[PDB]
Every structure is written in C-alpha cells, then in structure tokens.
Design a protein around this nucleic acid. Structure first.
Ligand SMILES: Nc1nc2c(ncn2[C@@H]2O[C@H](COP(=O)(O)OP(=O)(O)CP(=O)(O)O)[C@@H](O)[C@H]2O)c(=O)[nH]1
Lengths: 498, 85, 82, 205
RNA sequence: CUUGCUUCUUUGCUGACGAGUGGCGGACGGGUGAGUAAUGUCUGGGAAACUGCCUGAUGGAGGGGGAUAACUACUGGAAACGGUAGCUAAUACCGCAUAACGUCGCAAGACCAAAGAGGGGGACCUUCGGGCCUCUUGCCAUCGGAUGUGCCCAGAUGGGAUUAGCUAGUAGGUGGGGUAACGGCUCACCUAGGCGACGAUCCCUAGCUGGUCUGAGAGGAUGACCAGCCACACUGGAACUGAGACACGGUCCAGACUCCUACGGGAGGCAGCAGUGGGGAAUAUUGCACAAUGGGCGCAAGCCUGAUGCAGCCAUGCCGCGUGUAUGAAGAAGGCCUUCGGGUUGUAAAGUACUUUCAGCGGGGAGGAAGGGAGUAAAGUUAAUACCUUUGCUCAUUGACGUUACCCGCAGAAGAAGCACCGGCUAACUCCGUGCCAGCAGCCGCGGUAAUACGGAGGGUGCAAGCGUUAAUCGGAAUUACUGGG
C-alpha cells in the first residue's frame, strides 16, 4: 500500500471532443471555476488545483479542417468526453470521432449541452444516438420540459432532486436541495403536470433501457449520458463526482514488444504535437509528454531513442490553470512542457535504454495550397526562418523549390487562415494575401538509398524541391508524374515522416 | 532584487540610526566646547574638554572614528583652549 | 592576503601550471608579484619534470604567504633530504 | 593535398625528368618527352625571367611533392637559419621523411614512399611516423616494422636502389631494411642540376 | 500480537537543519568601452597616509546590565506585506575596574578595549548545570613586514585658428572647519593675480598601454582575442553598512519602459553565461561538472562557483594527412583540331599485382589525480598510554570529457576534389555561335563578320579543402621626402 500507486490512481484523463459550435471553451472555463483556479484556434492543457483527484484536460479544435491534432491526442487520453448539441444532432463529426475511438475501446461519457435553447424529445435523441452510432446508452436524469423551462435535475441512482436558478454565469451560487422524489411540495414549486410527464418519462426510461456496468464500461459498450447547460453554472457541477467514480486508472499503452504498465519505470514521454506557440521571448516548440509511467525527478537525464543521445533536461514547465508555472515535479500521469529548439519531431520516443518504438502517428496526407510570394519584400528572413519554424508541425509543412521564390505552404486541412493570423506576431510581419494557383496532390515523400539517388538528382535536377526537414520527394504536379516516379523504381526502405 | 543576501540591507538600516546617533551625540559634545570658545570661560572650556575626551576616545576605539580624526580634534581643540587660557 | 598558487596555463587538453606568488584578490591568470618555478602534470619521466626555487619560497614564508594544498604537495615532492 | 594525376605530363611540362615515373622499368621514352608537354606544346615560348623562376619553382616542387603554402613555410624556416638560404632550403627539402625513404630505396617512386610512410610502416627511432613532412634529425635510424616488413613491395623496388647513385649521407642495411641517417647533405651532392637561385629570387620579391 | 516483526502519543536526546539574529564574503572572480584629450593611461620619483584577512614581537582576556528577531495569542490585505500585548539567548549591543613605547599637551597631567567557544580526563569538590588540568580556535591595544588602495610633480600621449583671449573661489596668503592625509577639499578677510602663440578657452573624434599588421630601417594604421590600469552597470544625482563601494546580481529620489492585481498596492533592470526581438553582409548551445586550479565560509568533514575544465556549431584563421601505388600501347573508346598525313586529351583510362593513412564497426587501454576518509606504528604536548599537529605504513576509493589520446582485428580502392585564369602587366592555346546587340574588365581596354580579350566545347596553367570577388592597413609611393622631393 505505497502512496505512489495510490496517487497514480488519482490521475485521470479527459481531453474533450465535440461538434463545431458546441461549447468546449465555456465548459473548460467553468470547470476552472470548479477547482478554485473565427472559432477555436488553440490547444490548452489544465492540470488542476482539484481537491479529491487531479484530472488532466487537453483541448483541441473541433472541425473537419481542424481536429487533425486529436487523432494523436486521443491516443494520449484514456477516456472520452462527447458533447452533442440537439440542433446539430448526430452528424458526420460524431461518426468520424467514433471511428477514431472504436480502435482503442475508450470509455465514453457524453454530455448534452445548450439547455437554454430548444431541445427535441429525449427518447428521439437517444434513439438517434443508438441508431446512427449503433451503441446503446444508459440515461440517468432528464431536465424539465422544453425550451427555457429546464429548471431541474432528477437523479435516479442518487435519488437527488436539484433546482436551477437563472443568471449565475459570473458567480458561483448554490441552490437548495430537495431530497424526496414523490414530494408534493416539489410538484407545487415546479408544476404538477410537467412533473407528472417527467415521472412518466422516467418510467419509460426504467422500462426501456438497461443499468450501469463496470467491466463493460471499460470497453465502452454502454456509454452513459449527462445533461445540463454550460452557461447556467449548474449542470457541470455534477460531472466531477462521475469523473472521480467512473474513470479507472490510466491503461497501459502498446509498444512493439508489449504493453508498459503505470507501475514501471523508464519514462515513456514521447512528444505528440509541436503546437503553434506564442512567443514572448522564447519558443520551446512545446513538449506534451506521456509521463504516466514513472515519477518525476528534478535532475533526470532523458535519452533520445531515435538519435540515441543522453540529453540533460532539468527544466519542466507545468500547466497550472493554463499559465506556464515554475519548475515543479509532480506525480506520474501528467503532461509537461519542455524547452526544445528544433530537435524533436512528432512521435520521437523516449526511454531509459529500451530502444523500441510505439505504434502511433495517425497523421494523414496533405492537400497543397498556393504559395508564398513575399509582399513587402524587404526582410525576407522572418519567413525563411519563422515558417520553417512552423514547418515541423503536422498541419504546416513549408516546402522550398530550387528557384528561391514561390515557397509552398503545405496544409492537410483547407483553412489556411491560421497561418495568416499567425503572421501577425513579434517576429512575424508579412501579410501574404492569397489567390488561386494549382498544386495538385501532397508531395508523397520518398528518399532513396545511397548509390541510387545521385543519378536521380543528375537526370532532372531542375525538377526537385527542398522540403521541411531537408527532403526531396519528386515534385507534386500531377498523378502522371507520380506514375513516372513509380516507373522510375526508387527501391528503398520507406519512411513516411507524416 | 530578489536575493537571499538582502539581510545586509536592513541590518545596515539597524546600523544607520544607532552608530550615527552615537556620532550625533559625539559631535554635539564637540560643538559644546565650541560654545565655550564663544563664551571665553577657560574653566568651562577645560570642563567641556574633559567631558568630551573619553567619549571621543571610545568612539575612536569602536571603529567609527579612525583614531586620527579624534586626535586632530584633541590637538586643535587643546590648542584653542590653551591659547585662550 | 598574498599566497602561492597555481595559475593553469597551457593549451586545451594540455595543462601547464605556474606556481606563482600573487594576492588572493587577483585572478588566476591575472596580476602577480613574481614567478618562481613551474609544474607540469603531464611531465612523465624525461630530462625535466619540475623546477622549484625554494629560496624565494622561504622568503615569502618569512613574509606570510599562505601555501595552498598543491604547492605544499610540491614542497613535499622537492624534499630536503630526498 | 596530393596531386594523384598525370605525374609524367609534369616531366614533359618541365622538360627534365622529375623522377615521378622512376619505377621498376628504366627510362621510358613512351610519352614523347621534350617535344609535347600538351596540346600546343610545339610553340616556343618567350620564356621571361618570371617565367623561368616560376618554372624552376614548380620543377623543384613537383620533384619534392611539396605544396605552395608548405614550401613557403620551408622558405621561412630556411630564411632564419645560418649560412645561406639556398643550401638550407634544399637541406630542409631533403630532411623530409618520405624523401629519406625514397633515397633508401624503400619504394620505386616518391608517391610510393609517401604511401609507405603514411600506412604505419616506416618507423624511426622506435617511434612510428605517419606524416611525410617529418623533419629528420641527424643521427637517426629508420626501418620498417615487422608486421609490415617485406610484403614484396619493398623488395623489387629495392632492386631499383641497386641502380641509383646510392648517396653518401645515408646508409641502408639491405638485409633487414634498417637505414641509418647521417650528417646533412652538401649542395654539391644532391642531383647537381636544380637551381636554388631562381627560387630565392622568386620568394624575395 | 509471530509481547518485538510493525503501528501509535510524547520526547532536540543524537546525526543534522527550513526560518531568524550574528560573523565573514558580497569592493575578488565575470561583462562593456558609453563618457573622458587629461580629473584617464605609460615612464620616473616623492611624502603629509591607510591596510580586515597573512605573519613577527610585547601585555590583557577582569567584573556587569538592558533590549530584539525567531516564538506565543489576535488582526488588516487575494498575494506581496505587517501591526498590536508579552518572553529570551549569543562571538549581537552598551556601560564599570585597569592600561602601556597608544591619543592630546613643551612638560606636569588627562583619556581610550574585550569574548568566549570545541575535544579529552587523574586527584579535590559536585546544589551532581560543572569548576578545575591540557590542547585547538577566536577577541582587544601598540609597533613592524608584504600585498592592495588613497595623494602630488616632470615628460610623453589626435585633428581643427573657418577656435584668440580665457578665468572671479579664479591665482596666492592668513585664520576656522573637513579627509586615514598636504590641499579653496570647504567657509571669513586681504592683493590682483594665474594661464597663453612652446596653441590658453571652444568643436569633433578616441578608453590608455605592454602589444598586432605592414615596412630593410625610419615611419603609418590599429590595440578585437592574452595581460595591467581607468570608467561604467536603463539615464542623472545622493548617502548608509563595511578596513576597502561614494557599489553589476545593495538603498533612495527625478524621468522613460514592462508585468500582476481582489485594483487598496507592489516587482524589475542580461554592456554575466546561455537564449529572444530589431539592425546588419556578418557571428553559436536556453549543454555537463567541481574530475583539476582558483575564489567564498568552516578547525575539519562538507556546500556554491555560466571563472574555469570541457562537450556541440561555423573551412572564420593556421598546421598536417588522405581521396591510391607499381606495371600497363591497341599508342583502345568518346571529345577537340587539322594540311584530314596525323596530333592532343593520354600512362590518362580499361586490365593485372599489392596496400589501407583518415573515416565505419568490433575489442584492449594510459595520462590529465594532487588529495581526502577509516585505521595502525608512533616523535611532540600534558599529570595522562586521553584530545590535537606531523611522518611512515594497511584498505575501500575520487573523471563531465570518455563508446578518450593511443594500440590491435574485419569488409572492400572500397566513403572522400574542387575554385580562378589563359591579349600585355602575369604563369598558359585553338575551334564554333552571334557581331560596338549580347557581353568582360584592376589599368591600357576587345567585340563595327576570319576575336589568342563575349558565351559554349576541348586543352593547359596556378592554388588546394579551399578557390575567386568585395571591404580596411602598409609596401611599391622618394605621389607628404628628418633618413628620402622641389
Ligand atoms: N446559452 C448557452 N449557450 C451556449 C452553451 N454552450 C455553448 N453555448 C454557445 O454556443 C457557442 C459555442 O461557443 P464555444 O465555446 O466557442 O464553442 P467550441 O466548442 O469551443 C468550438 P470548438 O468545438 O470548435 O472548439 C457560443 O455561441 C456559446 O455562447 C450553453 O450551455 N448555454
């Protein structure tokens, strides 16, 4: 009964995936209230000054052009918080997120948001979920009526009846507690016919659903739902008890040899994203890590596996309530931030001597948009550095042709307004307004072995282009040139590097 | 500045009254003898010199006065009080 | 406070110490009064390994120079009866 | 650093035999010496003073295999010595280790001697030397280590040593390949043909 | 209850120690040349001086008192940060006895100081806190020595006359005050002096020197890295502690800038090491460790050190090596020229025989390391075979570099050659395409249809992991001539 594993058990993961226009930022800002601490272009991590346990968050942009980040950061997070709006319903967003989450069998707690607006019938929404996702659910509560009449929460497995007050978005207030279920004073304070309809719907829940499970909750077969609004400061207050009681210890993750448990050593903190950092005086690029296996040390010396080097790293930033706090060590199960300068890419593994790799990197193939043409052409060095600084990321990869002009911006998504807004910083001052220039399909990256690529360079030396990380694939113009490249036979051990 | 060795600041504050206050009372005794120089009473001048001599020798001993200032005070003040007498 | 100490001259990965009399507030390669003898730690057996003039060292002992540990070890190396 | 190219074209370019193609075979006459240095070698040049100085410098250098910065360092070392600069410069050129290995007969040509020095085979005073620019001190003994001794490449090339002048200032054992170095060579002993005066006039301006 | 295998409340009792008082260090080490044309630096002297820590000599170290932090209880503020009512200790503070070659005075005479701790123990006495015996360490007063610092004088240390008079505490004296100290250093009175054509006052520039480059020498530019001095720490000014700062990581005020806030109020100064922005043509890593030296404290063990010892990048500069060697004519193939005979590329390449420098991998392996710790034999000390200093001697040992330098073995000539020029200066030749268009060029200069001068090809020359261009200094320039011109 050592306290080490007992506080490993107090470390839980809930990242947050949802629809566009769903309410990620509001529910995170209000969970920050619960621990006494365009749209969506950031990723934020909140460790917490929470009382009982210490449950990490990790935000991500939810769109189709966005959420390229969450394919590799849902691998970091054991559990899953779904947020579905009633006006949006079950869309292709939820089908894509479930095609992500079914590959690892994550436990899923869902949370229906936007209770201030109009919401359809509850049985209709649960039937839409169970039909278009083919996965059942177990409802616990249902608030009052429709429209703006939602003014209560009626628990079944806790037998607690709470009421709601309006206009509590700024300050934390408490509403009095009614214990009884068949209380006629509750029928007088709420409304008799509406409460009878709610009791009839709870009888339909008890007669047309199942109960909760614990061994099937781990795979995620019966996913529980939770109701309430993000603005009224009421519905998310009940989430914390479920986050404590339902989420298990963080599971082991697969390596090439076997699964590494959370009681072992040899820190497996590999880097997930290289996110677009804000730059007051330094960059640090970011270092999100999986330090679930092994308790922190202040003077520990990490080992880069893919370059096999002993790197002394003593400074580690912790994300206390969003602000990058001081030099602090903690208990295993957290996510760090380190001080890197162009050395570590996505998915570079770390151990203390176990020279093996993971099975991650779910990144995809890009769609090459238009150009860099350097408006106000004085001081070109800010984009020759600062976008190549952003070229190591999974979303942005800057490509360099030989003719030293017309640099290609490589985005996997469609909306390149992210980089245009990111060109307005202390070391970013060029506008580069976009137009239409056609570059067809993603520059499929391949580099040959020795005594073979020399003639490949010498035959068509005007048809090469440097890449992010000093690569030379062929050139991306058409499918016919890719067929000629396949006809050219570059026989090599293939590295995707995407 | 944020420093573990800021103790020498406020301790010097703890000095800058007390030692200086001793210097204060020291020089007032010296000025008292100058009052006798403005008085013309040689007996009062000798009494004031005998009153100021042990405290100025003690302040010359305690590191505040560097034993040549106080010697200069005794020298020129003795010269004044026996030129008057 | 005057002292007799080494000065660490030479090249990179090639040390060559200078036993020298200097004030303790001076730098290692800084100002010195006068030099006396030398020491070479990589001077394995050849025609000369260590010179050390004991007359000026005794004169600085007669003045109050604090001898460091390496200089006292060199005094115990240059022994009066050996 | 090394030339590694047309070593016999240089002998046609200077006209005299630079002994770069000394070899097992005798005087070749296989390259049309003195009448074809290159494509338009039938032309007779004006051949001025700076011309003959530069040709004499490049002739002595491609005899001894020394690059220009290194030969300028040898001239700077010969300038501070006693006597006269012209004898001292040729003494410093003879004091190279690969030249001593060449004079011993341990290799047919000078590049072979430089390769034999470079490949950890030549050992002087019990200490192996890889740099061919080793300034040979007087009263030394040069030999070949037992792990690299007589793998036939020293052997037949030693027969060329039976056809050379075999100069006085060094002695070879020829039974165990143990040479012996002696006093510095006189100017009237080394090759009797090269002109130090043009080199001194070139490096004096 | 396996009554000893653990949990548990008290307990500074031991090893040690967050915070606090106090001692030392912070005035050294590190960084820059902004300001400065002499208040700076260098050379040579001088007296009217100071000096903790180092050390020599001579004495004392006797006897007392009062506060305060930390702490206790409450309270203002979110934090930063205190206030109120009480308590205590010291090598912290302050009195009392005495005091000498110390201070004052011609002398008589008067005055000036402290602090005790740690190890071990025989007799005596133990209110059994211990006095006592010894050793180590620390304090006070004086005289010295060295180191460092303060002060003064002479000479030397850029340009401008399109910079000609400047100065009024100014120059000198007397008296008072001030500094470790002469000194208008600072005040009261008296005279009109003081500097200046040997460049006074004013403007611009500049850290100075030992030195560096060039030059036969005399000279010219520079002084970035090594070292000494000076000045500075966002700017200006001022004081305190301290022997030493009129203070990089100390204080206050005036100004500008940044950040937090609950908005009542605070924090800050990378011309330190790294690192970031702007500028530029131009310059690096947000790395390891006290393994060695040195600095700080301690008796010692121990702690810190971005100085340093290194590690990573850059051909930025110097040095050395390799990218093969010997043989090899059918004088092969391809390119170029031609008189179309042939020549050149060319022993170059192909073939054969050997070799593996340096890199790759796999194994041995110094030196940078002196010390320090435990213990033994013990010479001193003492009453003591006890504590402590020192010397032999026994043992476990102290490396970031470091998979070190270096050596051996394995695979395969196998992984490793470019850049400028070819009319003269100045080293090296032709052909083709345009034709004062395109272009090259350091100067004279070519190209206006048969260019040794543009571009391309072949070939050669020179230098070599560097080669050309650009930028600065000197020589040539006796075109700043004192050497050495008119
Ligand atoms: N009244 C009300 N409005 C809500 C609630 N939750 C979300 N909204 C509204 O829906 C929108 C969602 O805002 P936002 O939090 O930025 O969405 P998001 O989930 O972060 C977007 P993304 O998923 O891409 O990260 C806003 O207009 C917000 O006001 C809720 O509980 N009540």
């Amino acid at each position: 009964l050592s306290p080490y594993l007992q506080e490993v058990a107090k470390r839980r993961t809930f990242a947050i995936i949802s629809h566009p226009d769903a309410g990620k930022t509001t529910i995170t800002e209000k969970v920050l209230l619960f621990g006494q601490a365009g749209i969506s272009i950031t990723t934020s991590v909140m460790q917490f000054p929470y009382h009982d346990c210490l449950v990490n968050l990790l935000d991500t942009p939810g769109h189709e052009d966005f959420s390229e980040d969450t394919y590799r950061t849902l691998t970091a997070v054991d559990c899953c918080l779904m947020v579905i709006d009633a006006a949006k319903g079950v869309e292709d967003r939820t089908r894509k997120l479930m095609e992500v989450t079914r590959l690892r069998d994550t436990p899923i707690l869902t949370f229906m948001n936007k209770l201030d607006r109009d919401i359809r019938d509850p049985m209709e929404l649960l039937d839409e979920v169970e039909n278009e996702l083919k996965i059942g659910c177990a409802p616990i509560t249902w608030p009052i009526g429709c429209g703006k009449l939602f003014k209560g929460v009626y628990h079944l497995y806790k037998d607690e009846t709470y009421l709601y007050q309006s206009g509590k978005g700024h300050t934390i207030q408490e509403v009095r507690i009614v214990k009884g279920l068949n209380n006629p004073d509750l029928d007088a304070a709420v409304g008799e016919d509406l409460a009878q309809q709610l009791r009839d719907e709870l009888e339909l829940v008890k007669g047309a659903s199942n109960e909760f499970d614990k061994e099937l909750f781990l795979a995620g077969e019966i996913t529980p739902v939770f109701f309430g609004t993000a603005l009224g400061n009421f519905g998310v207050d009940h989430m914390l008890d479920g986050l404590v009681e339902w989420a298990p210890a963080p599971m082991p993750r697969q390596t090439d040899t076997r699964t590494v448990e959370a009681s072992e050593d040899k820190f497996t903190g590999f880097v997930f994203k290289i996110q677009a950092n804000m730059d007051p005086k330094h960059r640090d690029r970011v270092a999100f890590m999986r330090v679930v296996s092994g308790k922190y040390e202040k003077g520990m010396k990490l080992r880069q596996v893919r370059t096999a080097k002993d790197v002394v790293i003593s400074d580690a930033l912790t994300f206390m309530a969003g602000d990058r706090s001081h030099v602090e060590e903690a208990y295993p199960g957290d996510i760090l931030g380190l001080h890197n300068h162009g050395t570590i890419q996505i998915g570079d593994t770390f151990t203390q001597g176990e020279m093996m790799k993971f099975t991650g990197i779910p990144n995809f193939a890009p769609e090459l948009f238009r150009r860099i043409r350097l408006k106000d052409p004085l001081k070109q060095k800010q984009l020759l550095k600062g976008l190549v600084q952003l070229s190591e990321e999974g979303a942005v990869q800057v490509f360099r042709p030989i003719s030293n002009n017309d640099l290609i911006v490589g985005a996997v998504g469609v909306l390149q307004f992210d980089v245009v807004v990111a060109r307005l910083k202390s070391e970013y001052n060029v506008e580069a307004v976009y137009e239409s220039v056609n570059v067809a399909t993603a520059r499929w990256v391949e580099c040959a072995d020795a005594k073979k690529f020399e003639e490949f360079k010498r035959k068509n030396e005007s048809q090469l282009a440097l890449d992010g990380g000093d690569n030379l694939a062929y050139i991306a113009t058409s499918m016919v040139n890719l067929r000629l490249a396949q006809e050219r036979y570059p026989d090599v051990q293939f590295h995707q590097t995407r | 500045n944020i420093k573990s060795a800021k103790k020498r600041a406020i301790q010097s504050e703890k000095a800058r009254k007390h030692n200086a206050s001793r210097r204060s009372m020291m020089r007032t005794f010296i000025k008292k003898v100058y009052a006798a120089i403005e008085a013309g009473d040689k007996a009062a001048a000798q009494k004031a010199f005998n009153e100021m001599q042990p405290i100025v020798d003690r302040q010359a001993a305690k590191g505040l006065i560097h034993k040549n200032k106080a010697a200069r005070h005794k020298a020129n003040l003795t010269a004044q009080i026996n030129k008057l007498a | 406070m005057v002292t007799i100490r080494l000065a660490r001259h030479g090249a990179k990965k090639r040390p060559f110490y200078q036993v020298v009399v200097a004030d303790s507030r001076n730098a290692r390669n800084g100002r010195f009064i006068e030099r006396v003898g030398f020491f070479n730690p990589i001077a394995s057996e050849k025609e000369e390994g260590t010179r050390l003039d004991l007359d000026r060292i005794a004169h600085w002992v007669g003045q109050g120079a604090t001898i460091s540990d390496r200089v006292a070890a060199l005094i115990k190396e240059v022994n009066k009866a050996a | 650093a090394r030339y590694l190219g047309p070593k016999l074209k240089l002998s046609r370019r200077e006209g005299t035999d630079l002994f770069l193609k000394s070899g097992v075979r005798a005087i070749d006459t296989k390259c049309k010496i003195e009448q074809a240095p290159g494509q338009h070698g039938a032309r007779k040049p004006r051949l001025s003073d700076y011309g003959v100085q530069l040709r004499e410098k490049q002739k002595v250098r491609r005899i001894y295999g020394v690059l220009e910065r290194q030969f300028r360092n040898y001239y700077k070392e010969a300038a501070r010595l006693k006597g006269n600069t012209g004898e001292n410069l040729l003494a410093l050129l003879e004091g190279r280790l690969d030249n001593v290995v060449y004079r011993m007969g341990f290799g047919a040509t000078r590049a072979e001697a430089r390769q034999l020095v470079s490949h950890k085979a030549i050992m002087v005073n019990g200490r192996v030397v890889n740099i061919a620019s080793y300034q040979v001190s007087p009263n030394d003994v040069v030999s070949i280590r037992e792990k690299a001794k007589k793998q036939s490449r020293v052997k037949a090339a030693l027969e060329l040593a039976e056809q050379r002048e075999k100069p006085t200032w060094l002695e070879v054992d020829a039974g165990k390949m143990e040479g012996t170095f002696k006093r510095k060579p006189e100017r009237s002993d080394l090759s009797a043909d090269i002109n130090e005066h043009l080199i001194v006039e070139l490096y004096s301006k």
